């Protein structure tokens, strides 16, 4: 069971799961999640988060085949676990409006507590609105949305990256003054702004593109990827404070962040901290 | 082969590809491809046929599972097959731009033909243009576009029904006197037109909302469809001519339709002898 070779997603021609060796090394039957505990929660009922999830799960490499992705359940659900504790609700939606994809092979089968969160929000996971009608009535001066969350996994690097819809939606976040959350490869989405400097001089923590040239050694993927959003974010302002992966956040003002799967505590801490302070007053 | 109970998808919670005994009654490892010889086919390399494919595989059923769906491949590759045998092009998009999704668990793997003009296209479909960049520069009053293919699989049921896209593309090809080629569920697309009476007094086949109510009593779906496309096209002025199916295709005006899996080959003779007289005229 030790084996490297990509392992055949069935749903889909020459696609592939990670292997299993390298799902034995990046995924657990258990999440690390902890400290989700607020004694003095959102009681306001107003504020709630968006959620811009991945509407595709197969990624294509460099070679032709399909990595078999999807956002990241470990990335996606702890962060909305504290923040859900600190009483906040969420609404997910996709740019197409087709359900979220998750990367299954990384959800933590016997984790109550997460499972527990999805089965809250799968309806939703399952069913998301479309980002364009959110667009249209749900944001502006006087939206009900203290922030946005873009979730990781590599399923953030298929549409998100150059969307026009996204840039509306940073646009808003950023002209709204509203806080921005993500982590690993959600940071690909704020690429959707172009070349309109937005995000200029912004400090952020994001998978390392070196890790990605390498877990395919391992067969995590069964390719490698045809670009690299960490040198595009760089591009057009972004300072990366990681080279490395620790399970590290980083809050630049309203922009908080996450360097991987292993931040998804970290992150649903740092952000539930950054809410409540900002509800307290 | 004997089991009806529904297929796991593995890719995707609570998703079910049909039961093996379903399989075993609705596909086969070879097509019935016939009769694609074109003596002389279209040479003047500039018509092109529109292809709007499904770009979402799990389709949500009454129960809450996901039907794990998308393109049907025979209805797909055998109309394709013939019109190209006549010397059309295509050109393949999706609503979001993500890839075509084909109900792998019905394509022929041991038909030679069928899976090599499946290769000829692999990259279309893998990587499909969007409709909206198609909808943009490629239309007009001076297409290249000698008519619009819509391919059945429940996963047309999808997005296109009420797209406002694929209004566009079906208002478009009506005013401009284009072929509309479509197949089993294929037509449900034609919804997207909403309350434009457009299309008030044609007749066409179409898959039986009778028989989709039937199939999931042998696995073939993991619940039972939410509505009913037949009686929507119906109530917008369509006259379904089929009860059943039998591989039945019909042609009112340039509206060319085919009833189910089963009229893949007749509806690519019939759209390959209608294009390729006009071409001629």
Known sequence: ??????????????????????????????????????????????????????????????????????????????????????????????????????????MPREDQEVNGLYSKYQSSFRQPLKLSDVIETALGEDSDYIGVFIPGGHGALMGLPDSQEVKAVLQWAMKQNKFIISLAHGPAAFLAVGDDPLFAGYKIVAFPDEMDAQTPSIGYMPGHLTWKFGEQLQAIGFELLNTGISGQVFQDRKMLTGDSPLAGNALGQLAAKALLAEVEG
């Open 1 to 106: 069971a030790n084996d490297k070779h990509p392992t055949p997603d069935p749903a889909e021609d020459n696609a592939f799961f990670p292997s299993a060796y390298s799902l034995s090394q990046f995924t657990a039957s258990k999440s690390d999640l902890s400290g989700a505990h607020y004694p003095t929660p959102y009681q306001g009922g107003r504020w709630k988060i968006l959620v811009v999830g991945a509407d595709e799960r197969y990624l294509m490499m460099d070679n032709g085949t399909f990595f078999s992705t999807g956002n990241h359940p470990v990335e996606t659900l702890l962060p909305m676990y504290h923040l859900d504790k600190a009483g906040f609700s969420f609404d997910i939606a996709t740019l197409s409006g087709n359900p979220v994809k998750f990367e299954w092979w990384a």
